[PDB]
Amino acid sequence: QISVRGLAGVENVTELKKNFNRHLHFTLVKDRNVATPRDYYFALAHTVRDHLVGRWIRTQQHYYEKDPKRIYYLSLEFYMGRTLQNTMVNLALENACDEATYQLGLDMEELEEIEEDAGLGNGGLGRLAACFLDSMATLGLAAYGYGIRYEFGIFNQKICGGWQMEEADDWLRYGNPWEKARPEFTLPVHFYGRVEHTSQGAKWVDTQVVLAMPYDTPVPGYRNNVVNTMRLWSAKAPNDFNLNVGGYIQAVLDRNLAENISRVLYPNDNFFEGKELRLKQEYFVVAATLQDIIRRFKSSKFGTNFDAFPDKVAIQLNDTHPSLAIPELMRVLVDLERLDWDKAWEVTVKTCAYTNHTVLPEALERWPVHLLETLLPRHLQIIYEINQRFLNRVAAAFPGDVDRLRRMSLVEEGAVKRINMAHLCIAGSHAVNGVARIHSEILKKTIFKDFYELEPHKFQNKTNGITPRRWLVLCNPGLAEIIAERIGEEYISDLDQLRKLLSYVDDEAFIRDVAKVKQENKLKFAAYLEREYKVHINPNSLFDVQVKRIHEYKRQLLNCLHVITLYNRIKKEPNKFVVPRTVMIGGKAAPGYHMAKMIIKLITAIGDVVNHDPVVGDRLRVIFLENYRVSLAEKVIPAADLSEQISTAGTEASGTGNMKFMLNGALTIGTMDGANVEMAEEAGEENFFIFGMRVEDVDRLDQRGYNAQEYYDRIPELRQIIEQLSSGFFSPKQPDLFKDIVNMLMHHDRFKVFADYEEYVKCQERVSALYKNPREWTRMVIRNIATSGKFSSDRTIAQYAREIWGVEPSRQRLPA
Ligand SMILES: O=C(N[C@@H]1O[C@H](CO)[C@@H](O)[C@H](O)[C@H]1O)c1ccccc1
């Protein structure tokens, strides 16, 4: 139907149809008369997967022969979403499969909805890993993603009585056609035990063993015949585990304890919990991965001599979660390979690089020493030794500066002794990067200032990106097509080409097409809400959307205050015209985060009042988007008009949702925080709705002391809202329901919601004004899309490759 989705050749469609029928018969063991729609999805998935395997085998064969420097991206999260459409797009098979399924009397889109999200991540950090894998394959890098195969990913969110309920995400229930189990590469991981000293070095003995079994998932590049690997470890009990009838039975059932390591993703978005099971997950991925790395290095054309290790291996630590890679690599080199400390350390530093993903103090990993002492006794010893040698370097560089020593130490003294994992990562890496220019500067100026002064060369910026494959071509084919009509298809792997669209900003045909694509997206999403959730919205209204995990710093509460302001203004002057809005807010709250759960309840409670007020009519609707996840993002983002990016300046390291909205034709209201700053710089500040305190203003307010009451006293509209919340206007049966929210806003608000309220409301008025002028709204949209090229993860990854890993990207095809 549409050109960007590839050709539907006669030979291809015929071949797909017969391979589809073959899988249905031989693989699913069904015939057309008994086949469930799920069977049809699985038949298609197998048919598409077949087209991957030859390229997958030859790519990995190619790396063996050419022996390039290998990149290992270590993460505890890979937020992959669905795989079927992505694979079709990257292989140029989408139209052919659409045609083949049509002729079989099947709707492919319906089949696509049957696939479970691989929800092996919480939010931005996990999704970044997924975009990065796509870009690394597209850029022809010999890259491997290494993580954990959680049996249960991020919980499914149900809203019941306005409250979040969690249900297990049993994503493997029906099986995963995309993975290949590789039991031949099963590896032992050690826990507990004790350290013995002998004549020839330390030995780690009396350990418990858990097995690590890899599962490989293919990662196809965009139309370059490259297929890389994401390898995820699953925990398995050794067969002699724990080995009376009750005793026998119990010994078998106790195998569950070892396998619990890979059972479930920790649902903490921006917060730290020193739980033993989490530490075990962290070491499990690190120990198994490093053995795989070393095996592959020895089986190379060089391996014996580890001098060349950093020339053949790069290890990227996705935050501090896999930080145990540093002392684990030292352990292996020193204890097992018998290298001297100094050489081992040189190899380690040159091998490892660390990316920081937040400055929020509560999110930083600080493990109690007694935990590491029990679980990983050898690693604690190595960490102590790293610390002593590091602090000797500090002492020599800043003689007499005793407080610098305590500030820089990897060991934090106190009630309980802790290891600061961030300090470990800086010491043991040759590069440290933030994820947006302002974030990277904040690192050098505040939290890692001491380390920057000691080793300035180590610190870098790598502004985040998103993949234009999933986040344009896949989720917004209509916009991809109208763009390709003007400028061709090469922008898909070279997003800077979107700049050519600037010479169409006054093109009346293009303006009409951009606005038409948006309207179609909005109509489709408006229908989705009715069909799947029985809610009725006005598709002519401005689609005002804030989708992201629920946290105080992201200030969903500031959005709530605006919503209530609009409602109160309508109730004050009912017969006055206002630009109609559909306000959509969505995101999951971490199970133990009480405030975040209260915020969700507030949003739904506002909806209950606003959506049923006959005086409001269809002029204002407030909807909480349930179970926000990658697949829902692919639907809502193309439908959005207004992107809410309203974190307190200095708190959102980068953001990536922001970039997704920019690429898909929404305008942005936001603070000068994270990547918003660079987005506004690229598009031009006049083409952005910027408001609020800058980082410097926040700092000034902190020095003076933030007094929320001042704002309450001086803003009558704000006062009205707080009184409504307090008095039970939004909870008539439970008048005090929101007392905690009011108390926090008035007395302990770390994120200064009130301080930005006035500028926010005023900026929102400017948004409404522009929306009243469809032509000028769309021209500003075009100027955003046209300048979104910097925010492709292809650019981000090319910068990592050149400036950190020391490898050159390649756009050349491998043979088909
Ligand atoms: O999700 C996290 N950070 C997010 O990473 C994204 C990708 O770099 C950024 O875009 C977000 O701003 C940041 O909050 C996070 C959460 C807890 C600990 C460490 C990191």
Side-chain angles (χ1 to χ4, degrees):
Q1 193 177 303
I2 62 155
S3 190
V4 290
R5 285 187 169 199
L7 306 319
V10 180
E11 227 87 275
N12 277 2
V13 176
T14 307
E15 193 69 26
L16 290 169
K17 278 158 71 194
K18 95 163 212 283
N19 281 300
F20 182 97
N21 284 311
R22 183 177 56 76
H23 278 117
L24 185 67
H25 184 77
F26 295 104
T27 304
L28 294 164
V29 191
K30 294 263 185 164
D31 68 342
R32 288 299 302 262
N33 282 25
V34 297
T36 68
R38 173 161 285 110
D39 300 309
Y40 290 130
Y41 157 72
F42 278 113
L44 179 54
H46 277 91
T47 303
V48 174
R49 194 189 81 190
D50 284 348
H51 291 265
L52 272 166
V53 307
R55 295 153 166 122
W56 199 11
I57 294 161
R58 70 204 317 171
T59 303
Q60 300 308 310
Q61 189 86 241
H62 178 77
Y63 300 151
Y64 180 85
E65 312 279 38
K66 281 211 159 189
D67 190 38
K69 184 170 185 182
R70 266 109 167 184
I71 312 311
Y72 297 100
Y73 197 86
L74 269 62
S75 186
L76 271 71
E77 298 186 22
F78 289 97
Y79 207 174
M80 301 295 275
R82 296 166 174 160
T83 297
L84 183 58
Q85 202 179 351
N86 191 243
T87 306
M88 288 191 289
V89 168
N90 284 23
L91 263 30
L93 256 31
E94 196 170 12
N95 264 342
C97 293
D98 202 25
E99 185 60 44
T101 48
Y102 178 75
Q103 290 178 13
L104 267 18
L106 296 164
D107 186 2
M108 191 166 73
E109 280 194 18
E110 182 192 303
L111 270 29
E112 282 167 353
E113 295 296 320
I114 292 157
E115 184 177 7
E116 287 285 323
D117 286 40
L120 306 191
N122 276 290
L125 173 154
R127 183 53 232 182
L128 190 76
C131 285
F132 277 13
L133 294 182
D134 182 86
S135 288
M136 290 180 301
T138 295
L139 291 182
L141 296 175
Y144 304 78
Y146 272 91
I148 294 169
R149 185 186 177 264
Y150 303 108
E151 184 172 343
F152 300 95
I154 191 62
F155 59 86
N156 288 313
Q157 176 193 64
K158 311 257 208 67
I159 304 297
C160 285
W163 296 101
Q164 163 174 298
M165 308 298 300
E166 300 91 16
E167 79 153 37
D169 175 37
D170 195 19
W171 74 292
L172 294 167
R173 180 164 73 249
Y174 297 100
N176 180 11
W178 308 109
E179 67 186 11
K180 183 68 187 70
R182 296 295 194 202
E184 51 267 34
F185 294 113
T186 300
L187 261 26
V189 176
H190 304 265
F191 292 102
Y192 304 101
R194 57 180 170 83
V195 181
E196 228 168 52
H197 298 272
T198 65
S199 300
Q200 252 44 242
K203 295 238 302 292
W204 186 21
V205 302
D206 295 340
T207 60
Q208 286 175 29
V209 171
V210 179
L211 300 174
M213 178 180 290
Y215 287 72
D216 290 354
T217 293
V219 186
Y222 182 73
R223 269 107 110 154
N224 62 169
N225 302 321
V226 163
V227 180
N228 285 339
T229 298
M230 174 182 70
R231 174 162 289 178
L232 305 178
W233 303 101
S234 195
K236 288 288 230 130
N239 275 328
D240 57 50
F241 182 90
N242 269 211
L243 286 161
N244 194 243
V245 188
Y248 167 76
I249 296 292
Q250 196 59 58
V252 174
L253 299 180
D254 283 354
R255 286 168 65 94
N256 294 164
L257 275 40
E259 309 185 336
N260 280 348
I261 291 161
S262 57
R263 196 82 71 195
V264 62
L265 168 73
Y266 273 81
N268 295 317
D269 203 72
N270 286 263
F271 186 63
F272 171 71
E273 213 163 298
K275 293 298 204 289
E276 189 191 39
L277 184 59
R278 172 65 169 196
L279 183 55
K280 283 178 180 189
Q281 291 187 332
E282 291 183 351
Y283 182 63
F284 178 73
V285 60
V286 157
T289 298
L290 274 165
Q291 294 177 76
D292 226 25
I293 289 172
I294 288 156
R295 172 187 65 80
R296 213 176 270 120
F297 168 79
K298 290 190 171 186
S299 296
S300 81
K301 213 148 264 70
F302 277 80
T304 326
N305 172 250
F306 286 89
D307 286 22
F309 195 80
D311 292 315
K312 290 295 165 192
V313 178
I315 297 168
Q316 196 67 33
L317 313 171
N318 202 25
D319 211 81
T320 59
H321 310 156
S323 67
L324 288 168
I326 289 155
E328 173 67 10
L329 187 54
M330 287 300 285
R331 190 186 71 83
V332 171
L333 297 178
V334 171
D335 292 356
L336 309 180
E337 301 290 342
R338 311 289 195 195
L339 272 74
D340 71 277
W341 187 275
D342 281 359
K343 177 64 203 195
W345 186 245
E346 182 181 325
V347 173
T348 298
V349 171
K350 289 163 78 178
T351 301
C352 297
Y354 158 61
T355 303
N356 174 278
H357 294 266
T358 185
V359 300
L360 295 189
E362 67 270 24
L364 300 187
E365 289 195 297
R366 296 150 57 242
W367 288 106
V369 166
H370 58 77
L371 245 176
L372 290 170
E373 191 183 288
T374 313
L375 190 78
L376 303 163
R378 184 56 185 148
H379 296 84
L380 218 216
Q381 298 183 352
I382 285 158
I383 287 165
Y384 281 147
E385 190 68 43
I386 289 166
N387 192 51
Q388 181 195 285
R389 295 172 173 259
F390 184 68
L391 289 184
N392 286 171
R393 274 173 44 77
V394 177
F398 301 96
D401 195 342
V402 293
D403 206 78
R404 192 179 288 255
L405 293 186
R406 70 153 211 97
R407 288 195 316 262
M408 289 184 81
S409 174
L410 316 201
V411 183
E412 284 177 10
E413 253 79 21
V416 316
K417 290 224 293 186
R418 288 168 190 275
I419 306 300
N420 190 307
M421 302 315 269
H423 291 191
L424 205 217
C425 285
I426 295 157
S429 303
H430 75 273
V432 173
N433 76 283
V435 291
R437 185 208 292 145
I438 196 178
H439 168 61
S440 297
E441 291 297 317
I442 289 172
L443 291 180
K444 294 188 290 197
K445 260 181 248 292
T446 57
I447 71 170
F448 302 148
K449 189 175 172 286
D450 293 327
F451 298 86
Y452 176 68
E453 284 165 7
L454 184 72
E455 302 180 291
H457 57 272
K458 193 172 284 197
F459 291 81
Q460 300 189 26
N461 177 240
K462 298 284 168 282
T463 305
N464 280 167
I466 60 175
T467 177
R469 273 75 68 184
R470 184 170 301 267
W471 301 112
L472 178 59
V473 181
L474 194 153
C475 67
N476 206 347
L479 180 64
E481 184 57 26
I482 69 163
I483 294 169
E485 287 175 353
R486 316 311 199 279
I487 69 160
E489 275 183 20
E490 224 281 288
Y491 73 91
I492 296 166
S493 48
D494 193 6
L495 205 65
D496 282 319
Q497 290 204 28
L498 287 184
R499 282 201 173 265
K500 294 178 186 171
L501 291 178
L502 252 13
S503 60
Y504 293 90
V505 72
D506 297 308
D507 192 306
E508 203 72 26
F510 193 61
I511 293 164
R512 172 161 41 250
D513 283 339
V514 173
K516 183 182 90 309
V517 166
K518 183 57 70 183
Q519 190 55 50
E520 288 180 344
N521 289 344
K522 290 172 69 175
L523 283 158
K524 198 184 181 179
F525 191 75
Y528 174 89
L529 287 178
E530 287 197 35
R531 282 178 69 257
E532 212 93 309
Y533 295 105
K534 306 294 164 191
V535 282
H536 315 121
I537 58 158
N538 176 31
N540 288 122
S541 62
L542 184 161
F543 280 16
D544 182 349
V545 8
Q546 189 176 204
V547 288
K548 54 190 71 233
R549 292 292 299 254
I550 315 292
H551 197 111
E552 283 167 275
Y553 90 85
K554 290 162 184 295
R555 302 201 294 185
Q556 284 89 6
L557 276 170
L558 182 59
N559 197 166
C560 288
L561 294 184
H562 179 243
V563 171
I564 297 168
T565 301
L566 255 38
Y567 173 75
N568 285 339
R569 284 175 177 181
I570 292 167
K571 292 290 284 200
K572 203 171 182 71
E573 301 188 303
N575 306 120
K576 187 257 227 74
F577 178 83
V578 291
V579 175
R581 281 187 194 232
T582 303
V583 179
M584 302 173 196
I585 306 175
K588 288 169 191 181
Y593 193 172
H594 176 252
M595 194 54 67
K597 284 209 175 193
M598 290 313 297
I599 290 161
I600 288 167
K601 178 58 176 167
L602 215 218
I603 296 159
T604 73
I606 293 160
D608 284 348
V609 168
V610 169
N611 297 350
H612 303 103
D613 193 313
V615 177
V616 173
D618 71 345
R619 295 184 286 168
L620 186 60
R621 289 278 179 269
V622 177
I623 278 89
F624 187 88
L625 256 27
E626 167 179 288
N627 203 25
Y628 181 65
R629 64 201 186 279
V630 175
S631 69
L632 191 57
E634 293 170 11
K635 296 186 177 67
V636 69
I637 297 174
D641 292 313
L642 215 218
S643 165
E644 303 268 2
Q645 306 296 332
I646 57 175
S647 56
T648 310
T651 64
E652 191 72 84
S654 164
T656 53
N658 51 184
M659 304 165 187
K660 302 171 196 176
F661 285 98
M662 190 189 191
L663 187 51
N664 280 279
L667 298 177
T668 299
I669 186 170
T671 54
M672 287 292 214
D673 196 19
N676 294 0
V677 174
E678 295 163 73
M679 290 168 58
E681 177 171 358
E682 292 297 299
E685 296 201 25
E686 347 82 51
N687 302 305
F688 242 76
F689 298 102
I690 293 148
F691 74 95
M693 293 181 290
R694 315 309 202 246
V695 177
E696 293 86 358
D697 300 309
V698 171
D699 285 340
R700 260 160 70 251
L701 235 191
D702 281 332
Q703 289 173 9
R704 189 161 84 236
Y706 176 68
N707 177 221
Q709 180 81 42
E710 175 172 298
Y711 297 92
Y712 176 97
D713 286 346
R714 325 227 268 217
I715 312 162
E717 282 190 307
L718 186 58
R719 187 181 318 118
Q720 182 188 10
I721 298 173
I722 300 307
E723 292 174 326
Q724 280 172 323
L725 291 176
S726 288
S727 69
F729 186 87
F730 294 98
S731 55
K733 290 182 178 185
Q734 326 169 60
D736 75 312
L737 186 65
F738 300 113
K739 67 156 197 163
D740 289 347
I741 294 180
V742 177
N743 184 49
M744 178 278 283
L745 255 16
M746 295 288 269
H747 309 296
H748 325 86
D749 186 5
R750 295 169 59 207
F751 305 103
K752 303 166 173 61
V753 172
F754 287 7
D756 275 332
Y757 170 86
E758 276 204 306
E759 277 203 45
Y760 182 52
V761 167
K762 278 143 92 160
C763 185
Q764 282 280 23
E765 290 175 356
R766 303 203 291 107
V767 171
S768 282
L770 218 220
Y771 196 83
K772 268 152 75 181
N773 195 327
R775 184 190 143 85
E776 294 298 325
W777 181 272
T778 306
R779 291 176 71 249
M780 196 176 283
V781 167
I782 289 148
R783 276 190 279 260
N784 276 241
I785 299 168
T787 59
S788 68
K790 183 188 172 176
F791 306 108
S792 165
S793 48
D794 299 344
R795 184 273 310 156
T796 308
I797 287 296
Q799 292 180 323
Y800 276 91
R802 293 180 185 124
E803 302 170 35
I804 295 166
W805 306 325
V807 295
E808 286 296 318
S810 181
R811 272 275 61 204
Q812 296 159 121
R813 261 89 275 199
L814 284 177

